[PDB]
């Protein structure tokens, strides 16, 4: 796309506001577990891993349809703000788990592995394909989106394993990444943070603007008119009175600041 | 909806608002024992039966502050709000953590210090123009609040709010009686209102904690607006927790700080 | 204070150099254990709360006489000192690469003597006048009549253990001065710069930085700094460093000095 | 000594590529790609030898720019400079992953251990090969279990410290070992590189990825590397944790390296 | 000195390069154990605190000669290019030591207190003596400067006890520090992070440059031709196999630029 100059005037702002629900495993707001992942197995050998249905975490997402327009003029992202909601919610060790101190304490706070990410783009992000176990069997949940082929090499990065995410909770997050040799319109940022039982650090402000704008000064431009946003916001683990473990997910919302921009 | 013209200039154009908030933690009364500090914590025996006791939850603290009278006649053709300019916010009393003698459990086969407050830290402060407006949202859509009716909690509970169910939303308006565990600022409104959180979990995590009185906190927004004060009312909120109180036999109790604000207001023309 | 303009010229400027001794517990530079806490010991319970004397640390505090100057009062204006910035490092730091010292030690008898650790409190103060108190406790029954020496409230009360305005004092005495219950009151030293910091936990590692190349700007927003009244400068602080853990584990706080070196220039003020 | 840029038309061009890790299975047709063997502890520091495959290597590549000419008799050449580089770790999110084959948490009914502890980070972009010290934890480890190592012919007791005369340049990929080879500051005028350790036993990994970020290659002088012989040599090293096995067994893992690296021409003294 | 203006011209610039081994406490490089201390042993009580000879870190230092000069002409250090060399050789977990997952997981990295400082000034860096323990007995190692005399008043700061930095791998850490009421002809930076097996983190590159000018513009001005580098990089532990445990330390390299100063 070439890009030509920003149009001026009234009507050549406008702003998109969502948020998007946390797709740990269980992912229907009408059913237990809402907000959490099954409760975690493990494989007994790398040949027979094969996750349980909904304990995977799987990455958000949205296409949010833009206002109409029409060189041709396109809708360039320009900003945005967004937050991940609900932080104060684990500030709660009431819940029945499993406690400090020979049962007098308080009960464990959701804690561990912290994933945090987030994309705002003009199209779908593209995904690579890598994963920590080539033999993963995700036939549990047919639902899932994953390679038809197994092989050894994507325990690596292996470019004929590619995709792109266009469907809400269903991507998982443990083999798919964001692919670095493409997304030229799509701005994406993460974190990781491992470990056990490490601590969650979270903020929250409504204070903080993100740019979009590129190195050249120019956004994620719309293509068709359609804005894709993204994240994943993997708090910690739930611990249960006896040991067994669930991913919990926070909410993320996004102001997402849209220009009007003329290209050829 | 408010349309703000120009900021009115000279002297007797700008004030200054000084206040602190105790904290919350269940133990709301300054007249009796472990003020300052929650109830003993206990522990849901399954999560269709969690309901917490009474004085056991922290809650946000807040304060609706009066400022000066600035419109004599309120149907003239402008008005003078009080514009919300910054802040100079910090937790008073950190250096009361510097104390290993209190009855609690201690190191080293009861030779070494009492166990020094500990454990999780959580730390919010909000300054506007009107109420903070909150989004419900818990890690248990079955928590029991009955134990203490004085709290604010929704009238009826969904499997949902373990998300973000916009359906369940309400105001700051009460000191002492809304839950932070199931209570968080509404990040789909508060465009009159500025709020800075942060959260570090964990067991028994260090508090890091920092206190001066040297550090300004700029409340104006992008277009350069600072919350508006409607009907001449800053509102204030926070909550400082710094972790917990391990006693002899484990049990455990929140314990909080209070917050120093000094706000810098100006006056501001907005269109009546 | 009605603030006017700099003074200019020759011997506008001048410069304070000192360092402050930490008051740990054991305050006698002549004794064993000087630097350090004596023992902590734990209540049985809360209304039993009575520490030993010298188990407490206490703010560091000096006030430092300034060149006079103001023989006239009958004028329109006075000069005070104004305090710009000051340099300022906690001293020894090295001294905490000790894994020898009577200790106890890692891995059943073999390894390390255990360094230093734990809870980490700094902070520091430059002011023209004393150091403003508010009173702050996690006990309001705390008994410090072991001691009569530490200044305290002659009275207690639950509300204590928040903030209750009624409870006030000023920093005018070195090693008197409990940590534990006394913080800044940030309700006044608008004359003052104060900067604190705590790092807690039960054996939390120290972290600490030591460097001549860090100026500390002590003017406010308005571009004044502290005015020394009466021609005072106060310096205050206290670097707790962590817990030295004896043999049979017994401990004690582990406090370092603190140097300063405070710029000042003369400030026209209204008379 | 640069004189100016060259200006017109193909005076610009960019390189992109990746590097896998080389953690000790560094074939990709095999299992276990992308983790080291076992790692096994020596019984004495006189015989310390690791088996083959558990020893984490440098990645590194060497890439064809577009042909300048080399003439040593003219006055003036161009060569390829380097400007800037994107680069990013790939596979982050690969370590969201609990249920793997490893020892678990909680009277096994908790999660299975994430790849966890020691994290390096290093890369560099440079316009010859990256020059190596040598430099060793133990002076005697003996690395002839895998004849495919480059290290020193001869072994000494002051490689426990800097000793200069034990130097390599980092020539092929997959040999090297991180352990005892590190970027040597006293050369490596015309190479770039950056580097982080994060020890500790099971220490969480802390990461970022992130398509943002642009790393400028150009020094205190405005001058980036000059690309010899019209080669761009890439290294990298991405140790993220390692695996923890039923049994206790422990590998090493790593993850790729994305680069993308801007190069302009410049004109240079001959 | 009163210090006036740069020089110019030809030659007005010179730059130093140099290494510091470390100093652990075996310092011979033909020796076993180079670059780690003896072997750490630990007092029966504060008044029998006697260090075996080489189990005690003390600081690396160099005088280098510059070019001769010669208001005067000095030369003035304007910045430093320093690296810690030889993190690299942190990644090695198979070395004869404890190990973790009862006999069946890596061996123990170097672990724990971290110590890293480094000097660069135009004099001996000047010393305050200041111990955590007035009575440590340094004679099994008569080749250590110490003071002469003990005194309860040295666990505190203590003027009186004073020295310069003029030999390498003799002024113990652990009872010498920069005395930060003088040294104004050099700069210094220090960091310390204790506990038992804390993690190290360390960054290594060389595109850092760490200026050296005050806040006059100044650097340190080299007296009689003599630029002083002095530096400490305690990196951990090596734990033995029985638990024993020495000091590990790394080299420091230096690229310091200079420059010709007019002085009165
Ligand atoms: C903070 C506090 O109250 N400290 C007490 C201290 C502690 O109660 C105890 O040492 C635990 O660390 O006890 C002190 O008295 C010790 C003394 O107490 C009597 O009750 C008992 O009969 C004696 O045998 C002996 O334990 C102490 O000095 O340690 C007093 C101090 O106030
Ligand atoms: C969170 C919760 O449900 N708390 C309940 C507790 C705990 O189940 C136990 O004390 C175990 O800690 O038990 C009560 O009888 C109590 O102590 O008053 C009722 C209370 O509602
Ligand atoms: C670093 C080292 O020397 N490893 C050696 C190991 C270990 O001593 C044991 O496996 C304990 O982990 O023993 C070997 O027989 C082996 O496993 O093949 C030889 C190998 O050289
Ligand atoms: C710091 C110290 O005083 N070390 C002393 C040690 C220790 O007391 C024990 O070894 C316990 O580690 O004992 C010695 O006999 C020794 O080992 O050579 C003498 C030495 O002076």
């Keep these: 796309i070439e890009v030509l100059n920003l149009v001026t005037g009234p009507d050549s702002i406008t702003t998109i506001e969502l948020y998007l629900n946390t797709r740990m495993g269980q992912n229907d707001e009408s059913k237990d577990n809402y907000g959490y992942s099954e409760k975690v197995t493990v494989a007994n050998s790398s040949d027979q891993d094969k996750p349980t249905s909904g304990e995977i975490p799987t990455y958000s997402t949205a296409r949010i349809n833009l206002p109409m327009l029409n060189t041709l003029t396109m809708w360039?992202?320009?900003?945005?703000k967004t937050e991940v909601v609900?932080?104060?919610?684990?500030?709660?060790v009431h819940m029945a788990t499993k406690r400090m101190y020979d049962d007098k304490g308080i009960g464990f706070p959701v804690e561990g592995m912290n994933f945090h990410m987030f994309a705002v783009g003009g199209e779908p992000l593209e995904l690579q394909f890598l994963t920590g176990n080539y033999r993963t069997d995700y036939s549990a949940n047919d639902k899932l989106v994953?390679?038809?082929?197994?092989?050894?090499?994507?325990?690596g990065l292996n470019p004929h394993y590619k995709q792109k995410l266009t469907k809400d909770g269903a991507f998982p997050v443990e083999c798919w990444?964001?692919?670095?040799?493409?997304?030229?319109?799509?701005?994406?940022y993460g974190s990781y943070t491992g470990g056990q039982?490490?601590?969650p650090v979270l903020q929250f402000t409504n204070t903080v603007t993100t740019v979009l704008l590129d190195e050249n000064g120019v956004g994620p431009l719309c293509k068709?008119?359609?804005?894709?946003?993204?994240?994943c916001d993997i708090v910690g683990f739930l611990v249960g009175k006896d040991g067994?473990?669930?991913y919990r997910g926070l909410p993320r919302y996004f102001n997402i600041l849209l220009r009007k921009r003329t290209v050829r």
């Excluded at 360039?76 to 945005?80: D, G, L, T």
């Excluded at 609900?86 to 500030?91: M, T």
């Excluded at 990444?177 to 994406?188: I, L, Q």
């Design 177 to 188: 990444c964001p692919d670095p040799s493409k997304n030229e319109n799509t701005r994406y």
């Design 76 to 80: 360039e992202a320009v900003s945005v």
């Design 146 to 155: 994953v390679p038809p082929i197994k092989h050894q090499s994507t325990q």
């Design 86 to 92: 609900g932080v104060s919610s684990l500030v709660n």
């Design 197 to 199: 039982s490490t601590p």
């Design 224 to 231: 068709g008119d359609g804005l894709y946003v993204s994240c």
């Design 244 to 246: 067994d473990m669930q």
